[PDB]
């Protein structure tokens, strides 16, 4: 009846934690904006270990993988743009004339460029979009680069492709990634079907506003997610059941000219326009959009009561803030997105919705100031043919709720894919009473303590053990090693370093848990047990150090005599 403390190493118990994840991809490109050489190849085997008898609490709005992804996305963009020509001298005043077709959208500007060579000051002509040039004086023929007054504009290297490539996040040693497989998971709350993965599915890092593109579709129906949901100040992420095809075109061809800035470096701009001037535009099928709004309104009605639902467009302002944005083909498109959110549902202008679009070359990306990118002109017709997969809606009084296209920041897109993933820290050390004194990873996490220790080996085998990303990974590896050694030193001072299950000779105190072994090894899982005695963990460990050992080491010294 007298019970003794036993230490188990490799216990399938975890705590919520924030860490740095590894970057994996399908090796299959070169000169990609996402710098694929900084990511490792993925393992063709997806792993995917289903956790039986495990229900976990997921919260997409507190998911650290979203902040990590946003940081990595920004870092990769800055790394990709760093080795490119900076447009230091292109701050000179530009003498512009309108191009007569888009009436005044494209301006033909003459300007005088100085160089580092200083052989001569050269006069050049170039075409720019209305959104890139800002009138600097009352004179209606003086203009300057939009970003000149605040920063030096960095030109993107034409060799850099902006095509999104799937990115997988993989758990570092010492951590695990859980995935919620509930078909109707709402992004917040318990999930009854949870699996553990090594790497997430591929995430396309598509940069867009208001409408989510490509990504992934909902399995059963349109699902509308938010945090408080009653609060107006939350981003509403709508994941669609079926995608809507959007065909965006930039019909103008143009030509590309190089104006040398210095040795080995040049500014790439548009020369002469070939063909007619035609407005860039996007075509969305009207009937499919009808069905998308019908489904969204139905799902909104279920949570906001049977009120009138109205979709309004954004207010006037800078096109980078209030208009839809995307970058297919390596060109940067902004579209009005106002022929889509202009309807009242309560309770035919053709069969295709054609949205006007505008092209901008100087982009202040990632909601930052002081840095800007100049996108070199592409020389052909730009086709998109992308899949609209989910919306970002915001909410703003006579019995009507007003919804508008909108969003927070780019993290709202990552949540759209990352809502089902969670990162957890594994705590392999557990302590339990026993009678005697001195499947897959987490497969038994939901099982009772009995018959879950027979898989401790798995947690012990797996889980443990000049670029900036390289140094950050180095720090992560050092921290993982330090963590493993902290566990090994705890086993050392307890005399347990030589085996996974270490039996001690310190009695179990009924004040810690006044329960029979059947109440402990059966009935409870390891997580419930570790929670039950959490408040005494620091006390229990002290006795393991002070009992047996120290007293036992002293006893060991005198056995020779």
């Amino acid at each position: 009846e007298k019970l003794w403390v036993t230490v188990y190493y490799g216990v399938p118990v975890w705590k919520d934690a924030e860490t740095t994840l590894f970057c994996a991809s399908d090796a299959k490109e070169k000169h990609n904006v996402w710098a694929t050489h900084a990511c490792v190849p993925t393992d063709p085997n997806p792993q995917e270990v289903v956790l039986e008898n495990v229900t976990e609490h997921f919260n997409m709005w507190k998911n650290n993988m979203v902040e990590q992804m946003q940081t990595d996305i920004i870092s990769l963009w800055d790394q990709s743009l760093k080795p490119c020509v900076k447009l230091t001298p292109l701050c000179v005043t530009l003498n512009c004339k309108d191009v007569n077709a888009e009436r005044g959208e494209i301006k033909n500007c003459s300007f005088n460029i100085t160089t580092e060579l200083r052989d001569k000051v050269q006069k050049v002509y170039a075409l720019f979009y209305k959104l890139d040039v800002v009138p600097i004086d009352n004179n209606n023929t003086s203009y300057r680069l939009i970003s000149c007054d605040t920063s030096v504009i960095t030109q993107a290297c034409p060799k850099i492709s902006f095509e999104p490539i799937p990115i997988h996040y993989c758990a570092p040693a010492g951590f695990a990634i859980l995935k919620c497989n509930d078909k109707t998971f709402n992004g917040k709350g318990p999930c009854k079907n949870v699996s553990t993965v090594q790497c997430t599915h591929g995430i396309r890092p598509v940069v867009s506003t208001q409408l989510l593109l490509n990504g992934s579709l909902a399995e059963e129906e349109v699902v509308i997610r938010s945090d408080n949901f009653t609060n107006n100040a939350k981003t509403i992420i709508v994941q669609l059941k079926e995608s809507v095809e959007i065909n965006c075109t930039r019909p103008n061809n143009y030509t590309r000219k190089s104006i040398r800035i210095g040795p080995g470096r040049a500014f790439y701009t548009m020369g002469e326009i070939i063909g007619d001037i035609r407005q860039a535009h996007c075509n969305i099928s009207r009937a499919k959009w009808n069905d998308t709004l019908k489904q969204i309104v139905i799902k909104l009605r279920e949570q906001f009561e049977n009120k009138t639902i109205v979709f309004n467009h954004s207010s006037g302002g800078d096109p980078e803030i209030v208009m839809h944005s995307f970058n297919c083909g390596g060109e940067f498109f902004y579209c009005n997105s106002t022929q889509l959110f202009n309807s009242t549902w309560n309770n035919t202008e053709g069969n295709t919705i054609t949205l006007p679009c505008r092209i901008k070359q100087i982009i202040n990306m990632w909601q930052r100031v002081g840095q800007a990118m100049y996108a070199p002109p592409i020389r052909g017709q730009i086709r998109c043919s992308s899949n609209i997969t989910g919306l970002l809606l915001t909410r703003d009084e006579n019995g009507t709720e007003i919804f508008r296209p909108g969003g927070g920041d780019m993290r709202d897109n990552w949540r759209s894919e990352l809502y089902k993933y969670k990162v957890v820290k594994i705590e392999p050390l557990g302590v339990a009473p026993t009678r005697c004194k001195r499947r897959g990873f987490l497969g038994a996490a939901g099982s009772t303590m009995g018959a879950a220790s027979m898989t401790l080996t798995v947690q012990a085998r797996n889980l443990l053990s000049l670029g900036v990303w390289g140094i950050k990974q180095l720090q992560a590896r050092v921290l993982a090693v330090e963590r493993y050694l902290r566990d090994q030193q705890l086993l050392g001072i307890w005399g347990c370093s030589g085996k996974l299950i270490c039996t001690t000779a310190v009695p179990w105190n009924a004040s810690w848990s006044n329960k029979s072994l059947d109440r402990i090894w059966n009935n409870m899982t390891w997580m419930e047990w570790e929670r039950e005695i959490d408040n005494y963990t620091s006390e229990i460990y002290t006795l393991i150090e002070e009992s047996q050992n120290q007293q036992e080491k002293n006893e060991q010294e005198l056995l020779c005599l």
């Epitope: 930052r368 002081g370 909108g406 920041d409």
Partner: antibody, heavy 123, light 107 residues
Framework: QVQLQESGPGLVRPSETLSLACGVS????????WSWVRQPPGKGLEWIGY???????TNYSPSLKNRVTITIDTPNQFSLKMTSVSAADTAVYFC?????????????????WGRGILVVVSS | DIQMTQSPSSLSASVGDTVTITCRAR??????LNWYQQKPGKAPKVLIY???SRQSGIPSRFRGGGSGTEFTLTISSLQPEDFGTYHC?????????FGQGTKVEIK
């Protein structure tokens, strides 16, 4: 420490021009964004506009761009001229210095404020 | 123009507690949100620059942060000197609009 002081008429008619000056005491109109911001009673604040001390370049809020002109007069004084001032424009007007150079404490925040002049539109 | 809101519109707390004021943007601004403190009858002074960067001379009791559209100002160990109206301003894009302001009464 740079100090600013608003000066101008307290009462303006519904149809005439509003003219407010902002003097600089321990300083001058340096190469910062010198700006005006409006605060109606009981409301928050709204931007009126700014003039860059480097040149004569100005910028104004689009909703007021066609009525407000901000200029620099003396090296130590700048002013806001707002035409066709309506009853809705009664407010406390503040002038200030907006920092934009990153290497200072403020990177982008109205750093120097005046004391504020309360302007009432009435007959 | 980016529209700004703030919550709660009316706040009160006793001396020594910790309070939070949340400033909300219709559109994301990165970290470019400033915080100001206005005393009744006086012009405001800035407390926080780029969302989290505190002005010299302001004690460490004033903390803040956030990104995108939802930002917070946290005032630890609330003092009688903290009575006043707090404001938030976006510097990301012109016009640099302000929220309606939160009145903080000290009890």
């Amino acid at each position: 420490q740079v100090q600013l002081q608003e000066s101008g008429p307290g009462l303006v008619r519904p149809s005439e021009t509003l003219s407010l000056a902002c003097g600089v005491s321990y300083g001058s109109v340096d190469h910062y964004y010198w700006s005006w911001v409006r605060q109606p009673p009981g409301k928050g604040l709204e931007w009126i506009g700014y003039i860059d001390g480097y040149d004569g370049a100005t910028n104004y809020s689009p909703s007021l761009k066609n009525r407000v002109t901000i200029t620099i007069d003396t090296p130590n004084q700048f002013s806001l001229k707002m035409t066709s001032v309506s009853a809705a424009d009664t407010a406390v007007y503040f002038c200030g210095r907006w920092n934009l150079y990153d290497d200072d404490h403020a990177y982008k925040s109205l750093a120097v404020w005046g004391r504020g002049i309360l302007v009432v539109v009435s007959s | 123009d980016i529209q700004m809101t703030q919550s709660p519109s009316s706040l009160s707390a006793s001396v020594g507690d910790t309070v939070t004021i949340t400033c909300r943007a219709r559109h994301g601004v990165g970290e470019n949100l400033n915080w100001y403190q206005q005393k009744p009858g006086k012009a405001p002074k800035v407390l926080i620059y780029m969302a989290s960067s505190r002005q010299s001379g302001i004690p460490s009791r004033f903390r803040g942060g956030g990104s995108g559209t939802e930002f917070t100002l946290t005032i630890s160990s609330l003092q009688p000197e903290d009575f006043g109206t707090y404001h938030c301003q976006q510097s990301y894009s012109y016009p640099w609009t302000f929220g309606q302001g939160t009145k903080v009464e000290i009890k």
